[PDB]
């Protein structure tokens, strides 16, 4: 039986009419309004009975520990939830009053204080202070996590947190739009799918900003986007997280591979994370057989066919690597990193396609690291490096090929690789502030230090419309420049011609109809002439 | 009369209170809840009476054929609808167990099977199998389409489909946000405006992913964004559609131009479509007078002033062209295509502005197609090609100008165009794995095969700090290299000087105060000297 | 007391049950439905009593002047509001029937007419017509503004306007998603925070399109995103606004600094604004001490440490500067401007990092302006210019450093800066349509006009496989090319050797074992020889 009112009005129940969230969920039919703050107990569970609910949040879930949401019906939506810690945690704050890193371990230790607004909870990855922490801190109980278990096709809009976060366990097609006012506890949003051999899919974050937390802003465990590439992160700012800007988990959890495949990471801005601007790796540490994943014999360590798409990434002043990945058959396009403290860009895999990379001021801590590294056989096109140090290489990619590479400024400009592509274009018009400038050519690049050819333009009078110069061109022999022709030395408009120091052999003139000058045993100047018919005569002057 | 309850509670009606969707729509005032699956009949119509409704979908519309929605009021919103086929269609599945194309027509034919999850319905564009299909398949009745007729200013959020789609007929300012869980039937979302001489406008898709369907993920017919550029597609993944990743229709439908103008396509990822990664063309096939559009006399075929903006596109392993367009005054920036089976990027129009294009491994099927083609007079800046074949050209753009072009690897590096821009920069520092490397200059590029100048650095001893080289510089004559100077041949530190084979004429020394060596009629070595005053003397040695 | 109906139905009140919006707001508990158009009076106020409301708009707010919304509770959402003018304003329409600028002041004056659809209200920034306007126009009363006062954490979805806009005063964490059907009055969305010394934060626009208005599409006053970078604009189209595409206010309002810090501007498309494609400046005009901001002594004019992130910007045919900013420590990446009437890209600050800039056809009005300008010491990497005029410089950046710069076409290609980075790569393969082409090197670039070295490839016969050329290489002296070697002049396969016009001094041969030819006082050809031991002898021929 449905009365006339039942047929004309929207069904909604509100939390303030009940003692518990379970009582409200039981009563709910269509909508569930969270109209008053709710103090949950660690381990509390809410059974939604498979109902397709609109959960409209106008207040906070407050607790230390986990609130479990079970049997939420496919197609439900959760609108502006907010997970807030009950206890104020001690946090480590690694920044000074100018917003720069503080690394002195004594000063870092002294930053540990109860805060709701910034910093993250100290933990094992905090190698500088972990061993020095007093018991109340290591043993603190705080942080509010929502754990949504075994739900499919749920949309969260504008979720928030204050020392809290969201854990989706064995879920698929979870869409989280625009996290905001979001101070994380551990990882901000986690898609945890390792409890079965299936792969989580369709789980994505789009929009917004996640701040702090001891973990990564978004974390994937045993997710596979399919050839569909349905899953990943788009349009996110990850700010000062304790681990990596976003992360794909590596190796095993609880005995099953927690790795990830075929995701899309598009437009992620990572500011001052403590580890890597993005960490899209699947293997880490020493090789160990994979469980419920490809074997070592199928794909060697660091070489899984992850096939991620990574594009439009920018990271700034990250304490780890500016952006990195392993595996193979990934596509990476448009990655910009500034002030990475370790390498600026790192490919730990092989057989990846890498384009439009810009690295500025990596190796910021001067520990002899390279700006860009590739460990395997990758293909790089459109690379710009601006090192603010001479340490190491601009591009260290011994087994890779490179094209369209530019190294700016006065830092390292060294490129080590298998193949460097041609330069193409029209007229060449180069200029320099220094009085002399050069074209240098270094073939046999694997086994030479010095160029085989140097052509020099040397400006002797720099007066506009009244310029004077010397032109030079030289080969090399025993590591020293030799055989140098010059034009216009001292303004005399002549060619200076290098001549042999002793008897020239016939083999030293390659082509018919050519000559070479040389000095004889008593310094007599002579000409060896190779005639048009290939025979030889010598003229004495 | 309104009672007190009427003044305090939200109006909503729910489908489960009625037999039909029309009965529910008639009763509706504010909200309409779809709380149970609805089995519609092909051709069913729902008249919404001009009401401004919130249509909250928590279940599916199920049918074979069309469900018409008429008189939906401006400002309505449709929340998470789902169009689901009643009959399971036979679909063609063009991929193997590794996710690679299957093209053997026998194997493709054998992939035809009833599926709800993947593949698309076989149709006329399936030239390889169309003629071989048994009657039950060609004549199958399946697929669920919502047709929204003559509505303005409607927002759809998170629409879904299972062998279904959405058709907007004579609509304007339709916004479709984040299609998802979306397996299309024909084209996924279509804006169909050719029934009148007006142009549809403001119709856009933003976000999400559309999969399969026999058509294009989003299709525009007689839409014009205005100088406003209000209309198009942003932030979409188009996965394995049967036609093109997104498409602007060409030519006429039912006797009226179905073409499109002034749209924005921003951040589209197209994976393995059967035709073109994007198809932003307006004319196709043989020229025929346009109806209710610009005449042939006003704009020639392929040269309509479409003025689209196309940017941030990436396509992978598309069976057609990686990305293409016609018309003029379009702006194209940041297009990356991998593994296009036809051309990687194609401009079929003229007078377009094209920047930041990256094409890798186009012409994947080795049918002698070029990596990048422009048919008209376009302007290209910032082009990277990496062909994995020597077939054809990297850039085939005879009437275009190019700047900042790079061709990687060992594939084709040929550039054919009207003008190639200058290279600018500072010191030049080039390197190569091979023992010799070159600077080559090929002026008269329209009519030469061989370079007019080659400067060679040839490393003879590649020992670090103990290098030896020969430097060479040569002109060309009758297609063969000639006049070669060398420095340091065989380590003798001398210049090898080319001399004339016979009498040098006075005209063969251009400048006053210069000399040339030559051999006389009996092989006598001589010097022709052009004195400082321009007169001549000959020295015999 | 709550009855059984109270416990099962959603609370909503609707405007049509009341005379005023205040009466409806007073009655509201959860939701407030705007079900009929509401005619507000200028200065009207609505007190929402701190309630957390869902304001569901299905009709318009209509008025001339301001509607104030006060005490709206944190966490409220405002769904599809529409601000519509009561009086139809006179607007100026600066475009012809082809959508091109009209600049003849007589024609502009004649475009002033009552419109609801396009143009903006004439004002003081309209220097061409302001003094010529008849009283009814300058004194017109029109335009509908919603002013939301002192609210935190409010989301607006899909707001609209017809000669209207949205003003947020002393607000924080306002998120405006997807403005649309939005014809602005002044600035479209403004975050106005100068009334106190606090800085507004978290205020952002994401998505959509704003059209016309006399101001800027989005305007920031005294906002600071924090090191968090929480605030700014993402994914917006700004179309034909009367000021700048988006803007950070400069200097003071009412005696307090109205400047802005640490915002993100990502993916803004600006079409035909009357001032600058984006205006991200903090100081303007003549230096004056800052109030409640950094002093002049702390940071000089134009050099505040704004630390904005600006990326993925595209602007077209803007009447002002294509895109510009001041301050320092900003990051700018991926900015494309077409048809800017003033400079294409302008850095008025110093110590900024600038990458991936493409400027085409700036200085469109031929007023002798440069394509790209930097006033301070910035770092530029990856620059493409295509000037359609020879006026001025491609890059005018005297105190900056540049790397990877390309200048296309036949317009200006001049680069003025402190340091130009090296070109790196492999073999060099250049080509040209002209019969001759060159490598030119211009060291001492600050003080020279002409190159110190020119190497020329000159094609004399352009027949495929039958090519003939002359190779040339020359220095410079007294501003004229000199000392020219040639190879293969007139097809004789010889070297033409430049010789001194008079006695060569010993100093004119640098290296041991070298010779130079010269003419003696009676034109005798001679050889000065520098022997292997460094001593000299002269041979007479």
- CA-based radius of gyration for chain A: 33
The full DSSP string for C423-478 is: EEESSEEEE-SSSEEEEEEE-STTT-SS-SEEEEEEEEE--TT--EEEEEEEEEET
* Eight-state DSSP code of residue B411: S
CB contacts of C333 in chain A (<8 Å) are 314, 336, 358
The set of catalytic residues of A is 243, 276, 279
3-class DSSP assignment, residue A427? coil
Chain B: closest CA distance from residue C104 (Å): 21
Other CB atoms within 10 Å distance of the CB of residue B533: 11
Do residues A364 and A386 lie in contact, with contact meaning Cβ atoms separated by under 8 Å? no
Q: What spatial distance separates the first Cα and last Cα of chain A, rounded to whole Å?
A: 126
The set of catalytic residues of C is 243, 276, 279
Which range of residues forms the domain containing residue C85?
Answer: 1-541
Show the CA angle centred on residue A69, arms to residues A67 and A70, nearest 5°: 140
Which tokens sit at C127? 């220097």
β-strand partners of A423? C428
- Burial tier of C128 (Cβ tally within 10 Å: 0-12, 13-18, 19+): middle
**Whole-angstrom distance, CA of residue C170 vs CA of residue C222:** 10
Contact: A490, C500; criterion CB under 8 Å = no
Burial B218-234 (b: 16+ CB within 10 A, else e): bbbbbbbbbbbbbbbbb
Residue to mutate among B80, B183, B431, with most A CBs inside 10 A, is B431
**Whole-angstrom distance, CA of residue C231 vs CA of residue C248:** 12
* Eight-state DSSP code of residue A376: S
Other CB atoms within 10 Å distance of the CB of residue B343: 24
A415 lies within 8 A of chain B by CB: yes
A457 lies within 8 A of chain C by CB: yes
β-strand partners of A252? A257
CB contacts of B384 in chain A (<8 Å) are 355, 381-382, 403-404
Which tokens sit at C407? 């200048």
**What's the CA dihedral at A23, A25, A28, A33 to 10 degrees?**
100
Give the DSSP H/E element, type plus range, for residue A110: helix A105-110
- Only one residue has tokens 């006075």, namely B506
**CA atoms in the 13 A half-sphere facing the CB of B114:** 8
Burial A210-222 (b: 16+ CB within 10 A, else e): bbbbbbbbbbbbb
3-class DSSP assignment, residue A404? strand
Closest residue in chain B to residue A207, using alpha carbons only = B207
B404 lies within 8 A of chain A by CB: yes
**Whole-angstrom distance, CA of residue C481 vs CA of residue B33:** 85
3-class DSSP assignment, residue A135? helix
Chain B: closest CA distance from residue A43 (Å): 30
Do residues A463 and C451 lie in contact, with contact meaning Cβ atoms separated by under 8 Å? no
**Whole-angstrom distance, CA of residue C95 vs CA of residue C242:** 12
Overall resolution, Å: 1.5
Closest of A438, A435, A407, A441 to residue A422, by C-alpha = A441
Interface B–C counts its CB contacts (< 8 A) at 354
Give the DSSP H/E element, type plus range, for residue B39: strand B38-39
- CA-based radius of gyration for chain B: 33
The full DSSP string for C224-248 is: B-TTTT--EEEEEEEES-SS-SSEE
CB contacts of A2 in chain B (<8 Å) are 17
Show the CA angle centred on residue C37, arms to residues C35 and C39, nearest 5°: 140
C500 lies within 8 A of chain B by CB: yes
The full DSSP string for C147-160 is: EEES-EEEEEES-E
Do residues B338 and B358 lie in contact, with contact meaning Cβ atoms separated by under 8 Å? no
Contact: A384, C381; criterion CB under 8 Å = yes
Closest of C457, C506, C455 to residue C483, by C-alpha = C455
Alpha helices in B114-231 (DSSP H): 135-138
Chain A: closest CA distance from residue C307 (Å): 12
Do residues A342 and A277 lie in contact, with contact meaning Cβ atoms separated by under 8 Å? no
Contact: A531, B541; criterion CB under 8 Å = no
Within chain A, how many helices (H) and strands (E) appear?
A: 4, 44
- Burial tier of B106 (Cβ tally within 10 Å: 0-12, 13-18, 19+): exposed
Which tokens sit at C239? 């179309």
Residue B538 backbone dihedrals phi, psi, to 5 degrees: -120, 130
**Whole-angstrom distance, CA of residue B189 vs CA of residue B221:** 11
**Whole-angstrom distance, CA of residue A348 vs CA of residue B167:** 47
CATH classification of the domain holding A429? 2.160.20.20
Which tokens sit at A32? 């569930």
Which tokens sit at B469? 């080289």
Which tokens sit at C231? 């605030």
**Whole-angstrom distance, CA of residue A324 vs CA of residue A281:** 7
Chain A: closest CA distance from residue B330 (Å): 23
Method: X-ray
Find the CB nearest C10 among A12, A456, A467.
A12
- Burial tier of B87 (Cβ tally within 10 Å: 0-12, 13-18, 19+): middle
CB contacts of B99 in chain A (<8 Å) are 227
Give the DSSP H/E element, type plus range, for residue B54: strand B54-57
Closest of A244, A173, A184, A225 to residue A208, by C-alpha = A184
**Whole-angstrom distance, CA of residue C46 vs CA of residue C67:** 8
- Burial tier of C215 (Cβ tally within 10 Å: 0-12, 13-18, 19+): buried
3-state secondary structure B283-339: CCCCCCCCCCCCCCCCCCCCCCCCCCEEEEEEEECCCCCCCEECCCCCEEEEEEEEC
Residue B490 backbone dihedrals phi, psi, to 5 degrees: 60, 20
Chain C: closest CA distance from residue A126 (Å): 22
Contact: B355, C336; criterion CB under 8 Å = yes
A515 lies within 8 A of chain C by CB: no
Cα B44 to chain centroid, rounded: 39
Closest residue in chain A to residue B414, using alpha carbons only = A424
Q: What spatial distance separates the first Cα and last Cα of chain B, rounded to whole Å?
A: 126
Burial A473-487 (b: 16+ CB within 10 A, else e): bbbbbebebbbbbbb
β-strand partners of C313? C335
**Whole-angstrom distance, CA of residue A437 vs CA of residue A417:** 26
Find the CB nearest C403 among A9, A406, A492.
A406
Do residues B533 and A522 lie in contact, with contact meaning Cβ atoms separated by under 8 Å? no
Do residues B182 and B188 lie in contact, with contact meaning Cβ atoms separated by under 8 Å? yes
3-class DSSP assignment, residue B62? strand
Which tokens sit at B438? 């070159």
Q: What spatial distance separates the first Cα and last Cα of chain C, rounded to whole Å?
A: 126
Which tokens sit at B386? 């990496």
**CA atoms in the 13 A half-sphere facing the CB of C350:** 11
- Strand B256-257 versus strand B252-253 pairing type: antiparallel
Residue B244 backbone dihedrals phi, psi, to 5 degrees: -110, 155
B492 lies within 8 A of chain C by CB: no
Contact: C425, A435; criterion CB under 8 Å = no
B237 lies within 8 A of chain A by CB: yes
Residue C281 Cα distances to A225, B73, C258, C304, C306, angstroms: 43, 44, 11, 10, 9
The full DSSP string for C69-126 is: EE-PPTT-EEES-EEEESSPPEEB--B-TTS-B---HHHHHHT-EE-SSS-B---TT-
Contact: B493, A473; criterion CB under 8 Å = no
Contact: C428, B438; criterion CB under 8 Å = yes
Interface A–B counts its CB contacts (< 8 A) at 354
The set of catalytic residues of B is 243, 276, 279
Which chains reach chain C with 3 or more Cβ–Cβ distances below 8 angstroms? Answer: A, B
Find the CB nearest C355 among A237, A269, A358.
A358
Total count of domains within chain C: 1
**What's the CA dihedral at C112, C118, C120, C126 to 10 degrees?**
-60
Closest of C462, C439, C461 to residue C452, by C-alpha = C439
**Whole-angstrom distance, CA of residue B493 vs CA of residue B513:** 26
**Whole-angstrom distance, CA of residue C435 vs CA of residue A365:** 52
Chain breaks in chain A (C to N over 2.5 A) after: none
Residue to mutate among B425, B474, B516, with most C CBs inside 10 A, is B425
Strand order in the sheet with A453-461: C423-425, B428-431, A436-442, A453-461, A468-477, A480-487, A495-498, C514-519, C525-530, C536-540
Residues 146-175 of B with CB under 8 A from A: 158
3-state secondary structure C327-386: CCCCEEEEEEEECCCCCCEEECCCCCEEEEEEEECCCCCCCCCCCEEECCCCEEEEEEEE
Which tokens sit at B224? 């014009």
- Strand B247-248 versus strand B232-239 pairing type: unpaired
Do residues A391 and A369 lie in contact, with contact meaning Cβ atoms separated by under 8 Å? yes
Show the CA angle centred on residue B269, arms to residues B266 and B275, nearest 5°: 110
């Amino acid at each position: 039986f449905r009365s006339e009112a039942d047929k004309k009005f929207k069904y909604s129940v509100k939390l303030s009419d009940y003692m518990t969230l379970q009582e409200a969920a039981t009563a709910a039919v269509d909508s569930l309004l969270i109209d008053i703050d709710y103090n949950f107990i660690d381990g509390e569970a809410v059974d939604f009975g498979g109902k397709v609910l609109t959960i409209e949040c106008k207040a906070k879930f407050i607790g230390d520990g986990v609130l479990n949401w079970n049997n939420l019906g496919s197609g439900s939506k959760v609108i502006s939830p907010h997970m807030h810690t009950k206890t104020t945690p001690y946090t480590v704050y690694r920044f000074d009053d100018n917003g720069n890193w503080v690394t002195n371990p004594t000063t870092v230790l002294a930053s540990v204080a109860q805060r709701l607004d910034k910093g993250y909870k100290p933990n094992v990855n905090d190698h500088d202070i972990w061993a020095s922490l007093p018991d109340n801190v290591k043993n603190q109980v705080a942080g509010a996590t929502l754990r949504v278990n075994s739900a499919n096709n749920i949309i969260f809009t504008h979720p928030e947190a204050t020392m809290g976060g969201y854990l989706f366990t064995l879920c698929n097609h979870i869409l989280v739009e625009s996290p905001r006012n979001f101070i994380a506890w551990e990882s901000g949003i986690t898609f945890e799918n390792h409890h079965t051999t299936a792969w989580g899919t369709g789980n994505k974050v789009v929009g917004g900003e996640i701040k702090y937390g001891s973990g990564s802003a978004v974390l994937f465990i045993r997710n596979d986007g399919g050839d569909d590439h349905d899953g990943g992160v788009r349009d996110l700012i990850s700010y000062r997280v304790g681990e990596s800007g976003v992360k794909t988990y590596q190796n095993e959890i609880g005995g099953r591979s927690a790795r990830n495949y075929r995701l899309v990471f598009d437009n992620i801005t990572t500011i001052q994370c403590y580890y890597d601007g993005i960490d899209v790796n699947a293997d880490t540490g020493s090789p160990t057989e994979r469980v419920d994943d490809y074997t070592l014999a199928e794909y060697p360590w660091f070489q899984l066919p992850t096939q991620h798409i990574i594009r439009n990434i920018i990271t700034r002043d990250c304490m780890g690597i500016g952006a990195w990945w392993d595996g193979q058959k990934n596509i990476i396009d448009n990655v910009v990193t500034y002030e990475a403290h370790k390498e600026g860009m790192f490919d730990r895999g092989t057989n990846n396609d890498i384009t439009n990379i810009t690295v500025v001021c990596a190796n910021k801590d001067l520990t002899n690291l390279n700006q860009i590294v590739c460990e395997g056989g990758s293909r790089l096109r459109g690379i710009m490096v601006h090192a603010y140090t001479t340490q190491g290489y601009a591009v260290y990619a011994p087994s890779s090929e490179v094209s369209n590479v530019s190294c700016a400024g006065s830092g390292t400009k060294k490129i080590l690789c298998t193949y460097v592509a041609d330069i193409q274009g029209g007229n060449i018009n180069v200029q320099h502030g220094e009085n002399a400038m050069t074209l240098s050519m270094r073939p046999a690049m694997g086994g030479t230090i010095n160029p085989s050819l140097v052509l020099t333009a040397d400006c002797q009078v720099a007066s506009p419309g009244n310029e004077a110069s010397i032109v030079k061109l030289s080969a090399i022999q025993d590591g020293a420049r030799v055989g140098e022709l010059q034009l216009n030395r001292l303004g005399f408009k002549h060619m200076s011609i290098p001549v042999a120091e002793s008897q020239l052999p016939e083999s030293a003139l390659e082509f018919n109809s050519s000559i070479g000058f040389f000095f004889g045993t008593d310094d007599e100047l002579r000409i060896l002439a190779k005639k048009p018919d290939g025979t030889f005569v010598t003229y004495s002057l």
